[PDB]
């Protein structure tokens, strides 16, 4: 159905231990396809998916040059932020940036993104209009004024609506075998007596792609939103994901509970119960 491309970037200063470490990764949906690490033996944009390996040497030089120049601008920006926030030069700080686009099943632009964070907090973000900014505080407003004067939003809009969408379409076609295949979850319910008054019912989902999924428990057809323990969706390491949801049930009432599973790979939502 719908797809995304995203580039993530993190710079972490380490005063007294050299220059900041810079790591950037690119994803199409939940598939990593490129990485660059400034601490690597030979820092370069490295392919991580078979469908990107067909890109030529000119492509890799272009991406590598952009990563090296982004690592430099981030070092400069980390110094700038110390000034804007009146901070000491002694501490370690983090700069994060994420940009990219979402497209529908028809490959048309759904929305574009460009957002930055300092020390884990929102700093400045390009709004959905791709023409205005949301600054988190008076320091980000200084960057906003600079970015409005330089018409940065216009430059970003041209990339997000142009190259971002066209190259996302290109990668979806080149990688259609995997990027356009949904792997449905493999499901089961386990039962663990806790004592003689209560028991745990755990509903599992394994081997699915993409990561997006919904697992819920119902008791007599009513959602158990507050009483359900939901683990964060987690990577298996083979491209697929895993998730579980658990409920503590009064002994003898197990058949009153049903697990519900929604996933792109399923034509219809699944209903499971503890068997037997």
């Amino acid at each position: 159905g719908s797809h995304s491309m995203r580039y993530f970037h993190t710079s972490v200063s380490r005063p007294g231990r050299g220059e900041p470490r810079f790591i950037t990764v690119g994803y199409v949906d939940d598939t990593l396809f490129v990485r660059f690490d400034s601490d690597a033996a030979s820092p370069r944009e490295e392919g991580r998916a078979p469908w990107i390996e067909q890109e030529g040497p000119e492509h890799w030089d272009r991406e590598t040059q952009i990563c090296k120049a982004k690592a430099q601008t981030d070092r400069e920006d980390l110094r700038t932020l110390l000034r804007y926030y009146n901070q000491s030069e002694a501490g370690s700080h983090t700069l994060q940036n994420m940009y990219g686009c979402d497209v529908g099943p028809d490959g048309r632009l759904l929305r574009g993104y460009h957002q930055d964070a300092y020390d884990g907090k929102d700093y400045i973000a390009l709004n959905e209009d791709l023409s205005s900014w949301t600054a988190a505080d008076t320091a980000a407003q200084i960057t906003q004024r600079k970015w409005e004067a330089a018409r940065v939003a216009e430059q970003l809009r041209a990339y997000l609506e142009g190259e971002c969408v066209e190259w996302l379409r290109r990668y979806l076609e080149n990688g259609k075998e995997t990027l356009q295949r949904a792997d449905p979850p493999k499901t089961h319910v386990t039962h663990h007596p806790i004592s003689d008054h209560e028991a745990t019912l755990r509903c599992w989902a394994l081997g699915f792609y993409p990561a997006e999924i919904t697992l819920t428990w119902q008791r007599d057809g009513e959602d158990q939103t507050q009483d359900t323990e939901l683990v964060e969706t987690r990577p298996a390491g083979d491209r697929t994901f895993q998730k579980w949801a658990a409920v503590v049930v009064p002994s003898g009432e197990e058949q009153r509970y049903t697990c519900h599973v929604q996933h792109e790979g399923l034509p219809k939502p699944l209903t499971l119960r503890w068997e037997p």
């Binding site: 580039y7 690119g26 944009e45 272009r62 991406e63 952009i66 990563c67 120049a69 982004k70 601008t73 400069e76 920006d77 700038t80 932020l81 804007y84 940009y99 930055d116 200084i142 960057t143 600079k146 970015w147 330089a150 940065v152 430059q155 970003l156 990339y159 190259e163 971002c164 190259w167």
Partner: peptide, 9 residues
Amino acid sequence: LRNQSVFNF
């Protein structure tokens, strides 16, 4: 494909 544009804070 990355954005080639460079912007400073």
